[PDB]
């Protein structure tokens, strides 16, 4: 963290950066309807609710 | 005289069918038939109010790109068929909900829609879908709105629950307009003319009401010239 | 990113007199690159003077 | 054969009709070849190219 | 369909495989946007055969160029069908003709 | 200019024998335009213009 | 820009002089000698050059005066 | 609302001269620029009431192709000069007869016309002809009527020569429709009318009367 970021954290104490948002997003200038979702899970990994 | 003109009047309305009419305006002086005909055609073809289907909710359907058991058409084709529904909504309401429940084999048409009496279906023979099984059933909730012009679903300003399907709305009831200027037999003069406007619509709008609405729009837009000043 | 109206007014004021360079391949001579004053249009296609 | 087909459908044998300018209502000075053409939408869309 | 054509549209539509073509003749027992069930004629049964033909239609499947592959029924219940008849139209097909 | 432009300039400047409004005397280009817009004279009418 | 190239003579020299003047009006605090008319610094500089107010010698003289002060 | 339409908000009238003007109205709904401009153009060119020279008598001249000694201009050019004669006739008169008599050498102009006080010549400096010989005199009996539009001599077909009747004061009208936007609606129309009259009427007044005629033609329907 740059020193100014340290001062900003000292003033407002919020700090939640354990994980980074690397998510799938609709590409820009694309509007549509989700018609199918498929989930592939490796053999030996917990299957989520979906 | 020279400075005073003869104002046209609505002399005849001929209703060939429910979706076809001829309207005759007489008398018209030289050149005024073509001027009024073109102005009225451009206003009628562009700026006539109407009512159109905007939202459809079908039970058990999440989006248009799907099928329903016992129905031969896809949901996309059903929405396309609903785009051709001719609905007249009573004045004072810009929004209405109608329902369509039908079970059993047969063509599901517009005459099977349940409406509250403020809605008139002009084409009850319009086919919406086909049910191909005795166990098949369909239950839609259709939303009809008043408007003007063409408002696609994308252009609508942006919660919407999943299942509600947006339909592109063509509000204008006028489909085709033609006009002719023929000779008029008035008193003794021969310079007068007669304007005949042929209107092919979807049956929702009356001919006389259409003519008066176009004339009102033209007069309101001409007021700015009649009061020319720097604004 | 939210595409507010004031952003569109700012864009008009930015491009008011800012020339922009148009190029078509192959650039066989220097007239293959020319500068124009842009006029903002609704659509996705460039409008070229005949 | 084309002219016979046009005559059966009560259409001019030259395939040219009298068109009017929708902006003014004035007839174009010459007959215009009006008919029906099979047109295609090629997979070269400005959405994928801008 | 094209109003003006050459006559080869049916050949392309049938030999491309996009359409659903009746393997055996008979009477369409059931029609739906996703399934066609044909009751086969008595002359064309393999001895000891169920006697029905089932055609499951492709509905809104992505193609190699991100286009839509969709098959739409063009038959009614109770309609007689012979061998080689088009039961469903694939993309760019209209009643068995290339559109 | 090329194509339609040329064609238009070609069509407007051609000469026709015994067109409507032949032999008329015109005060200038403005009255020629007025005669054209009033269907008094055709575009290809041979006239005398000041 | 025919008037500007007539007043300067060379297009490249005109570009350089107009760039200096536009930088003076944008980065520096110098004010325009003509009505701005909601125009960008480049167009203002071109108009000033066309009017004969801005030349290379004039810019050098004003720079010398600023250095003296 | 379905009956609510955009009305012009910026109307700019620029006066190049006393007989030339440019009127810009913005914004208009899509397509209304062409509708209004075309309707106004037809009304102003072919239906606007006015007063104009129609018929002439020249002493010693029988046919329009005849020759007169002493006048540089031919008869047809004299008739052409009489067409561009801006004239006002007092209301209640549909027909007047003015006379032009001049002997000498030089330009015979419109200010040498004597009338009965019910006729006003807007352009006294208009040149009618040119006398070349001092022994030559010109005597003309000009008829001025009230009509509508632009009626040529051929449409109206003794010694009377017929003049093309330019009843309408409008000498030129052109209209252009440009793009205009309010908020993010970039499909609106802007109407620009470049207008030129003969001098009898100001362009703004002519636009007002044309719009009044068009509006009164729709009275039975609104």
CA H5-H7-H12 angle, to 5 degrees, is 160
DSSP-assigned beta bridge partners for residue D20: D27
**Chain H CA closest to residue C6:** H183
DSSP-assigned beta bridge partners for residue C20: C36
Q: Are G43 and G3 in contact (CB under 8 A)?
A: no
Interface residue C14 vs chain G (CB under 8 A): no
H touches F, CB cut-off 8 Å, minimum 3 pairs: yes
DSSP assignment letter at C30: G
B200 contact partners, CB below 8 Å, separation of at least 6: B19, B20, B174, B175, B176, B177
Distances (CA, A) of F22 to E96, F35, H165: 61, 11, 17
Chain E residues 43-72 with CB within 8 Å of chain B: 59-60, 70, 72
User: CA-to-CA distance for H33 and B35, rounded, in angstroms?
Assistant: 14
Q: Which helix (H) or strand (E) holds B151?
A: strand B150-151
User: CA-to-CA distance for E46 and E29, rounded, in angstroms?
Assistant: 19
First to last CA, chain H: 19
What's the distance, CA B139 to chain centroid?
26
Query: Read out DSSP for D1-50?
Result: -HHHHHHHTT--TTSEE--B-TTT-PBPSS-EE---------S--TTTT-
- F28: chain H residues, CB-CB within 8 Å: none
DSSP assignment letter at G41: H
User: CA-to-CA distance for B103 and B135, rounded, in angstroms?
Assistant: 7
CA B168-B172-B178 angle, to 5 degrees, is 135
The dihedral over CA atoms of H14, H16, H18, H22, expressed in degrees to the nearest 10, equals -40
Tell me the angle at which helices G11-26 and G41-51 cross, rounded to the nearest 10 degrees: 120
Distances (CA, A) of H164 to B30, E37, H140, H149: 19, 83, 17, 11
User: CA-to-CA distance for B211 and B36, rounded, in angstroms?
Assistant: 11
- C5: chain H residues, CB-CB within 8 Å: 183-184
DSSP assignment letter at H60: T
Q: Are B102 and B112 in contact (CB under 8 A)?
A: yes
- B230: chain H residues, CB-CB within 8 Å: 11-13
Largest Cα–Cα separation, chain E: 47
User: CA-to-CA distance for G2 and F16, rounded, in angstroms?
Assistant: 43
D22, D25, D47: which to substitute to probe chain B, counting the most B Cβ within 10 Å?
A: D25
D24, D25, D26: which to substitute to probe chain H, counting the most H Cβ within 10 Å?
A: D24
Q: Which helix (H) or strand (E) holds B84?
A: none
Q: Which residue in H145, H150, H196 sits closest to H170, CA to CA? A: H196
Q: Are H156 and H145 in contact (CB under 8 A)?
A: no
DSSP assignment letter at F43: T
User: CA-to-CA distance for G57 and G48, rounded, in angstroms?
Assistant: 14
Closest residue to B49, CB basis, from H2, H34, H47: H2
Query: Read out DSSP for B163-228?
Result: TEEE--EE---EEEEEEEEEE--BTTBSS-EEEEEEEEE-SSS-HHHHHHHHHHHHHHHHHHHHT-
User: CA-to-CA distance for H85 and H215, rounded, in angstroms?
Assistant: 30
User: CA-to-CA distance for H54 and H95, rounded, in angstroms?
Assistant: 10
Q: Are H168 and H152 in contact (CB under 8 A)?
A: no
User: CA-to-CA distance for B25 and B11, rounded, in angstroms?
Assistant: 6
Q: For B19, phi and psi rounded to 5 degrees? A: -125, 25
User: CA-to-CA distance for B36 and B180, rounded, in angstroms?
Assistant: 11
H touches A, CB cut-off 8 Å, minimum 3 pairs: no
- C41: chain H residues, CB-CB within 8 Å: 186
- D47: chain C residues, CB-CB within 8 Å: 44
Q: Which residue in H44, H48, H70 sits closest to H58, CA to CA? A: H70
Q: Where are the alpha helices (DSSP H) in chain G?
A: 2-8, 11-26, 41-51, 56-68
Q: Which residue in B225, B217, B216, B3 sits closest to H40, CA to CA? A: B225
User: Locate tokens 């069509």: which residue?
Assistant: F11
Q: Helix/strand/coil (H, E, C) string of chain A?
A: CCHHHHHHHHHCCCCCCCCCCCCCCCCCCCCCCCCCCCCCCCCCCCCCCC
Q: Which residue in B223, F39, D25 sits closest to H149, CA to CA? A: F39
Q: Which residue in H46, H21, H48, H84 sits closest to F36, CA to CA? A: H46
User: CA-to-CA distance for B60 and B97, rounded, in angstroms?
Assistant: 19
Determination technique for this PDB entry?
cryo-EM
DSSP assignment letter at H212: H
Tell whether the torsion through CA atoms of H101, H106, H110 and H112 is positive or negative.
Answer: negative
Tell me the angle at which helices B207-226 and H32-46 cross, rounded to the nearest 10 degrees: 70
SS3 C24: coil
User: What would the two tokens of residue D32 be?
Assistant: 């215009």
CB atoms B41 and D24 under 8 Å: no
Query: Read out DSSP for H78-125?
Result: HHHHHHT--EEE-TT-SEEEEEEEEESSEEEEGGGEE--SSEEES-TT
Q: For F48, phi and psi rounded to 5 degrees? A: -115, 125
- In this structure, the strands spanning F25-26 and F48-49 are parallel
The residue count for chain A: 50
Q: Which residue in H34, H191, H41 sits closest to B224, CA to CA? A: H191
- In this structure, the strands spanning H165-166 and H170-182 are unpaired
User: CA-to-CA distance for H155 and H41, rounded, in angstroms?
Assistant: 21
User: CA-to-CA distance for G10 and H196, rounded, in angstroms?
Assistant: 43
**Chain B CA closest to residue H39:** B35
DSSP-assigned beta bridge partners for residue H106: H131
User: What would the two tokens of residue B49 be?
Assistant: 């109010």
Cβ-based contacts under 8 A for chains A and B: 8
User: CA-to-CA distance for D27 and D30, rounded, in angstroms?
Assistant: 8
User: CA-to-CA distance for B17 and A11, rounded, in angstroms?
Assistant: 78
CB atoms B74 and E30 under 8 Å: no
- H41: chain F residues, CB-CB within 8 Å: 37
H28, H30, H38: which to substitute to probe chain D, counting the most D Cβ within 10 Å?
A: H38
G touches B, CB cut-off 8 Å, minimum 3 pairs: no
Q: Which residue in H44, H49, H56 sits closest to H144, CA to CA? A: H56
Chain B residues 149-208 with CB within 8 Å of chain H: 171
Residue H217: HSE in the Cβ half-sphere, 13 Å Cα cutoff: 28
CB atoms H5 and B226 under 8 Å: no
Q: Which residue in H47, F34, H31, H35 sits closest to B37, CA to CA? A: H35
First to last CA, chain F: 28
Q: Which residue in E28, H101, H22 sits closest to B230, CA to CA? A: H22
Q: Which residue in C36, B130, A21, B38 sits closest to D21, CA to CA? A: B38
- B35: chain H residues, CB-CB within 8 Å: 38-39, 42-43, 214
Those chains having 3 or more beta-carbon pairs within 8 angstroms of chain C are D, G, H
H103 contact partners, CB below 8 Å, separation of at least 6: H131, H136, H137, H138
User: CA-to-CA distance for H72 and H150, rounded, in angstroms?
Assistant: 28
CA C24-C26-C28 angle, to 5 degrees, is 105
Distances (CA, A) of H74 to B125, H107, H140: 76, 14, 14
- In this structure, the strands spanning E61-62 and E68-69 are antiparallel
Distances (CA, A) of H125 to H86, H109, H161: 11, 6, 23
Residue E23: HSE in the Cβ half-sphere, 13 Å Cα cutoff: 11
Q: For E85, phi and psi rounded to 5 degrees? A: -75, 145
Tell whether the torsion through CA atoms of H86, H87, H91 and H96 is positive or negative.
Answer: negative
User: CA-to-CA distance for B127 and B144, rounded, in angstroms?
Assistant: 18
The number of helices, as runs of H, and strands, as runs of E, in chain B is 3, 15
User: What would the two tokens of residue B77 be?
Assistant: 């084709």
Q: Which residue in B4, B58, H171, H46 sits closest to F38, CA to CA? A: H46
The dihedral over CA atoms of H101, H103, H105, H110, expressed in degrees to the nearest 10, equals -10
With b for 16 or more beta-carbon neighbours within 10 A and e for fewer, the F33-49 pattern comes to bbbebbebbebbbeeee
User: CA-to-CA distance for B168 and B149, rounded, in angstroms?
Assistant: 11
Closest residue to D43, CB basis, from E2, E3, E65: E65
Own/partner long-range contacts of E37-42 (Cβ < 8 Å, ≥24 apart): E38/E81, E38/E87
Interface residue B74 vs chain A (CB under 8 A): no
User: CA-to-CA distance for G59 and G55, rounded, in angstroms?
Assistant: 6
């Amino acid at each position: 963290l740059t020193p100014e970021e340290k001062l900003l954290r000292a003033i407002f104490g919020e700090k939640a950066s354990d994980v980074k948002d690397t998510s799938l997003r609709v590409p820009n200038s694309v509007a549509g309807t989700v018609i199918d979702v498929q989930v592939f899970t490796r053999d030996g990994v917990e299957k989520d609710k979906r | 005289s020279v400075t005073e003109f003869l104002k046209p009047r609505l002399v005849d309305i001929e209703q060939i069918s429910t979706t076809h009419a001829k309207v005759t305006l007489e008398p018209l002086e030289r050149g005024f038939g073509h001027t009024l005909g073109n102005a009225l055609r451009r206003i009628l073809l562009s700026s006539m109010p109407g009512c159109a289907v905007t939202e459809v909710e079908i039970e058990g359907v999440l989006h248009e790109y799907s099928t329903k058991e016992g129905v031969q058409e896809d949901i996309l084709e059903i929405l396309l068929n609903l785009k051709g529904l001719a609905v007249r909504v009573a004045e004072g309401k810009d929004e209405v909900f109608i329902t369509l429940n039908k079970s059993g084999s047969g063509p599901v048409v517009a005459g099977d829609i349940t409406h509250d009496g403020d809605v008139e279906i002009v084409n009850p023979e319009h086919v919406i879908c086909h049910l191909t099984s005795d166990n098949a059933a369909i239950a839609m909730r259709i939303k009809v709105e008043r408007g003007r012009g063409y408002v696609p679903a994308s252009a609508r300003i942006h919660e919407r629950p999943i299942g509600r399907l947006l339909v592109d709305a063509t509000f204008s009831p006028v489909d085709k307009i033609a006009y002719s200027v023929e000779a008029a037999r008035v008193e003794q003069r021969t310079d007068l003319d007669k304007l005949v406007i042929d209107m092919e619509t979807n049956g929702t709008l009356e001919p006389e009401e259409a003519i008066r609405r176009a004339a009102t729009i033209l007069a309101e837009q001409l007021d700015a010239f009649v009061d020319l000043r720097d604004v | 990113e939210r595409e507010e109206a004031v952003v569109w007014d700012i864009l008009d004021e930015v491009i008011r007199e800012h020339p922009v360079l148009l190029n078509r391949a192959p650039t066989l001579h220097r007239l293959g690159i020319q500068a124009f004053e842009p006029v903002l249009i609704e659509g996705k296609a460039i409008q070229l003077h005949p | 054969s084309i002219k016979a087909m046009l005559e059966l459908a009560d259409l001019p044998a030259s395939g040219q009709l009298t068109l009017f300018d929708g902006r003014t209502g004035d007839a174009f000075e010459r007959p215009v070849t009006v008919g029906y053409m099979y047109m295609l939408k090629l997979n070269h869309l400005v959405d994928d190219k801008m | 369909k094209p109003l003006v054509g050459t006559g080869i549209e049916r050949n392309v539509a049938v030999d491309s495989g996009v359409t659903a073509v009746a393997k055996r003749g008979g009477v369409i027992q059931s029609v739906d946007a996703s399934r066609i069930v044909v009751k086969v004629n008595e002359e064309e049964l393999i001895p000891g055969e169920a006697g029905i033909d089932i055609y499951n239609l492709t509905k809104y499947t992505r193609s190699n160029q991100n286009t839509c592959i969709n098959q739409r029924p063009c038959v009614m219940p109770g309609e007689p069908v012979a061998r080689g008849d088009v039961l469903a139209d694939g993309p760019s097909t209209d009643l068995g003709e290339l559109a | 200019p090329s194509q339609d432009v040329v064609l238009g300039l070609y069509y407007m400047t051609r000469e026709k024998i015994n067109a409507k409004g032949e032999g008329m005397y015109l005060t200038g280009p403005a009255e020629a335009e007025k005669a054209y817009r009033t269907k008094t004279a055709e575009l290809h009418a041979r006239v005398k213009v000041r | 820009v025919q008037d500007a190239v007539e007043k300067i003579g060379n297009r490249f020299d005109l570009v350089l002089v107009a760039a200096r003047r536009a930088r003076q009006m944008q980065s520096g605090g110098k004010d325009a000698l003509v009505p701005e008319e909601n125009d960008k610094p480049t167009v203002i500089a071109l108009r000033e050059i066309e009017e004969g107010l801005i030349t290379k010698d004039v810019l050098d003289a004003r720079e010398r005066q600023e250095q003296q002060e």
